[PDB]
Each structure stands twice: as structure tokens, then as C-alpha cells.
Design a protein around this ligand. Structure first.
Ligand code: 43E
Length: 495
């Protein structure tokens, strides 16, 4: 019943999908699936940012229109979403008419608030540095040329441009950060943002006259919208903006925008200012993840390691928010240890013993020992730890909690030696096997968002009905003695 709206930043399709795009989508997919399983009404968006001079230039090099090039390149990004088992509810492309309409509506809403004017984007510019400088940072030298602070020439350049009055939003933004401490996370991103805004905000250039591959400025179509208004507006286009009677519009404001660290300023300064101007509520959180370093191509990685192995590796190994590294060795070893051995072989050993010794039926549990209770209770408590962690986008901590249950369940199983009980105390063997399977059911439910296909197969070999797989079922729906289980197969083979 409670609504939950989560988004990824939109990708720029002037190339192939890379591991950065996949990482962001995987992480956001896991967060979306988690909230569905937690009983929320979820809407999950991703998409592509298709306008701009770079897309126009690539299109000319290839002898096709920009719209045609966008159609062609975005299709690989859509393929990436499919191959990664993304549950996104919609896919937004800034070339779509609905986006053109939404961007022109938010532009006009900011004009009506008094926040947009026509002027001159003008300053000392260094072609070699690709940077603008204040006059005070420059000096005319012996040759008569003016130089900027990096010792390269600068020259005055000037273009007509519309501006957003960002300077009017300094205090409102500082108020926002003070009243919503979680508005921009992790903490280091917040400190960078607050210091930036405290240093003083200048009005923001929001149009270009140099190319026509973009959305025309209403009332002045020699200008097109620059990236700021065009790309950021996607998040409301997908909910039917400007039509506030659309059923989807109740999802606004977003619960979380998931982004890379390089675009933090744009989501935590520019976007909220635009929203305030346009009389719209603000997202509850912007969370910036880090970057990954090989130390290549997501399709190749999925083929080589398996989808769920990659998904798990990326979310478990790198604390979400930090930079990290992947390598062949790290992926193989981590996924062999946690998935093929710990989880996968726990299921294979226990469930084959049920097949062989308990007639393929869940055994009827007797009294639980202290050890039995401890592992059962540990599994329950991991659900709560996972929920709290996911409220803070701490994916690694959710997975860590869940896989600590798996590690402990292996210790439990080995310590009980149920093979030895087969002779001496078959009923006790049955109870140990029941406990191991029931812990596996709870773990299976809890890992669905992170490794969906593999979790599903695990739950299928536990004969869990399709309508008993919500997080509420962890507590309410234990395995019933006497249930027929299918012959088990390894869920995670070793690499
Ligand atoms: O230049 C453009 N894109 C370059 C890639 C930017 N990628 C990072 C990003 C992503 C998102 Cl969701 C928002 C922003 Cl502001 C920035 N787009 C564009 C649209 C109209 S004119 C230029």
C-alpha cells in the first residue's frame, strides 16, 4: 500500500554500456525488489539521456540522424537492463515526446515563478584547459596574450543563454540540508555539497544556441535546453508530468535517486532548486555510489561469471558509496566461497540427505535444542538488520547479515553430524534436517532481491509456493513437515 519510487540516473548512449552503468542498475534493482518484497508499492525507473552536441556529432560521423543514432545505441542499454534481470517498471528516453512535453512544462513553471531570464554566458575561457576563469585569475603577459592561472591562454567568449536564478536558492538549499540530514548521502557527499552551497551560488546557464538536437526553449526556439533541465526532468516525465491527475503522479516525490558521485551537485543543488521553483516537493534522498576499477564489458562479465555471481560480487565486496575494485581472482574466489560453497553446497548436502533418507519429504521436527533455536533466531534477526541497512542504502551490510546466517548454518550443520544420527536417532536427524531447510527457506526469501533467479531456484527446491515468498513469510510461513521436495540440483556451480 505504501508507495516507494526509486530511480537511476539516465545513461548517455554515445557509446557502449560499461560496468559503471551495470553496477548502478544492479544496485538500484536490488533496492527496488527489496521494497516490493517488504510490502511496498514500488515504481522503479531507469533510462537514457539522448540530446546534445556529442550525440549530434556521432550521428554525422555515421551518416544518420541523431534520433536514429539514439534509437540504435539506446537499444544496447535496454539489452543490458534485460541481461541484468532489471525489474524497472518503465524506461525513459529523453527523445520521447512525453519528455519534450514535461521539460517544456517545468521550464514554463520556472518562468512563471520569476526564475528564468535571457542574458549572456560570458567569460575568460582557455581552450587548452577547457575552463572559464574570473578576470582576477588572469594576467596579460610579455607577448600581449592574456593567460589564466594554469599558464595557458584565455580569451573572452560570449554566447546568448537563458539562465535559472540559482543564486536565489542558496538559503533555501542550506535550510533543506539542515532539516533533512539524509537528503544527500553518504556523509562525505553531504559535506562537499554544503560547503559548495555555503561558498555562494551563481545563476546557471540552461540553454544553448549552438545545435538543434535538444528540446526547444518555449518562446525562443533558436535556443535548446542544455543538459540540466532536460536530463533531470526525466524523473517526473515518467510519472506523467505535467498531468498531476495521472495515477503514477502519486509516486512523486522520489524516495531515492541513485547516482554516481560525479553528478552529486546536479541532483543535490540544481534539481531541488528547479523543483522548488516549479512548486513541487523534493526527493527524500539522493544517494551517490562510487566507481569501480579493473585492478571491461558487462555482457562479457555476465557470460563469464554468471549474472547472480556478478550481482552478488558487486553488492557484497564494495561498501555502497565507496570506490572499489574487481578482478578475475577476487570474483572467482568470493563467489566460489560464499555462493557455490557456503550457500549452494549447504542446500545440496542437506536436501540430498532429505531425498535419500527422508523419502524426499520435509521431516517432521521434534523439540528444538538450544543450537536449533539460536540459528533459527539468527535467521529472523537478519531480516531486521537487512531492513535497517537497506533504509541507508547499505547493500553490503544487508548481504553481510544474510551471509553470516549461511556461514553459521554451515557450522551448525557440520556440528550436528546428522549423517551419524541416521543410525542412532533418526527422529533427531529429521529435526536437524528440518532446521537446516527452514533456515535455507528464510535465507532464500531474503536474498531474492540480490540474486533473483538463483533465490527462486533455491525456493523451488524447497517447494515454497509462489505466493509465500514475501518478507512477511519469513516469520509467518515455515516449512511444513511431510511436504514433498523435488530432487535437488546445485544452485551455484563452482567456477
Ligand atoms: O550533455 C548531455 N549529457 C552528457 C552526459 C551527462 N551524464 C551525467 C548526468 C546524468 C543525469 Cl540523470 C543528469 C545530469 Cl545533469 C547529468 N545531455 C544534453 C541534453 C540537452 S543538451 C545536452
Amino acid at each position: 500500500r505504501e508507495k516507494y519510487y526509486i530511480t537511476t540516473a539516465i545513461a548517455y548512449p554515445n557509446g557502449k554500456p560499461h560496468i559503471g552503468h551495470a553496477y548502478e542498475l544492479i544496485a538500484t534493482d536490488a533496492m527496488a525488489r527489496f521494497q516490493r518484497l517488504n510490502g511496498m508499492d514500488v515504481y522503479f525507473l531507469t533510462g537514457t539521456d539522448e540530446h546534445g552536441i556529442k550525440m549530434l556529432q556521432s550521428a554525422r560521423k555515421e551518416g544518420i540522424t541523431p534520433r536514429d543514432l539514439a534509437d540504435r545505441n539506446t537499444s544496447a542499454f535496454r539489452r543490458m537492463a534485460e541481461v541484468l534481470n532489471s525489474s524497472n517498471d518503465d524506461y525513459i528516453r529523453t527523445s520521447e515526446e512525453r519528455h519534450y512535453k514535461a521539460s517544456q512544462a517545468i521550464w514554463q513553471a520556472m518562468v512563471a515563478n520569476g526564475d528564468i531570464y535571457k542574458g549572456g554566458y560570458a567569460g575568460w575561457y582557455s581552450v587548452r584547459d577547457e575552463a572559464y576563469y574570473g578576470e582576477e585569475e588572469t594576467e596579460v603577459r610579455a607577448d600581449g596574450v592574456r593567460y589564466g592561472p594554469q599558464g595557458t591562454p584565455v580569451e573572452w567568449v560570449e554566447e546568448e543563454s537563458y539562465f535559472f536564478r540559482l543564486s536565489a536558492y542558496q538559503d533555501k538549499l542550506l535550510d533543506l540540508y539542515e532539516n533533512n540530514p539524509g537528503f544527500i548521502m553518504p556523509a562525505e557527499r553531504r559535506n562537499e555539497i554544503v560547503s559548495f552551497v555555503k561558498s555562494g551560488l551563481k545563476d546557471l546557464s540552461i540553454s544553448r544556441t549552438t545545435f538543434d538536437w535538444g528540446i526547444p526553449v518555449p518562446g525562443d526556439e533558436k535556443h535548446v535546453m542544455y543538459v540540466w533541465v532536460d536530463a533531470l526532468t526525466n524523473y517526473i516525465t515518467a510519472l506523467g508530468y505535467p498531468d498531476t491527475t495521472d495515477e503514477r503522479w502519486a509516486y512523486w516525490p522520489a524516495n531515492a535517486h541513485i547516482i554516481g558521485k560525479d553528478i552529486s551537485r546536479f541532483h543535490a543543488v540544481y534539481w531541488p532548486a528547479f523543483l522548488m521553483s516549479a512548486q513541487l516537493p523534493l526527493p527524500k534522498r539522493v544517494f551517490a555510489h562510487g566507481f569501480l576499477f579493473n585492478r571491461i564489458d558487462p555482457f562479457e562479465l555476465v557470460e563469464r561469471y554468471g549474472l547472480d555471481q556478478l550481482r552478488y560480487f558487486l553488492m557484497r565486496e564494495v561498501p555502497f558509496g565507496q570506490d572499489g575494485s574487481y578482478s578475475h581472482e577476487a570474483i572467482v574466489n568470493r563467489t566460489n566461497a560464499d555462493l557455490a560453497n557456503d550457500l549452494g553446497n549447504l542446500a545440496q548436502r542437506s536436501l540430498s540427505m532429505i531425498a535419500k533418507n527422508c523419502e524426499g519429504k520435509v521431516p517432521q521436527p521434534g523439540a528444538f535444542s538450544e543450537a536449533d533455536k539460536a540459528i533459527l533466531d539468527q535467521a529472523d534477526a537478519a531480516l531486521e538488520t537487512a531492513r535497517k541497512a537497506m533504509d541507508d542504502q547499505a547493500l553490503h551490510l544487508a548481504l553481510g547479515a544474510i551471509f553470516a546466517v549461511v556461514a553459521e548454518a554451515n557450522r551448525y550443520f557440520a556440528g550436528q553430524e546428522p549423517w551419524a544420527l541416521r543410525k542412532t536417532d533418526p527422529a533427531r536427524m529429521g529435526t536437524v534436517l528440518y532446521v537446516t531447510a527452514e533456515v535455507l527457506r528464510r535465507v532464500g526469501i531474503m536474498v531474492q532481491p540480490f540474486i533473483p533467479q538463483s533465490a527462486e531456484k533455491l525456493l523451488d527446491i524447497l517447494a515454497v509456493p509462489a505466493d509465500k515468498r514475501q518478507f512477511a513469510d519469513v516469520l509467518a510461513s515455515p516449512l511444513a513437515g511431510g511436504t514433498d521436495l523435488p530432487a535437488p540440483q546445485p544452485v551455484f556451480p563452482r567456477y
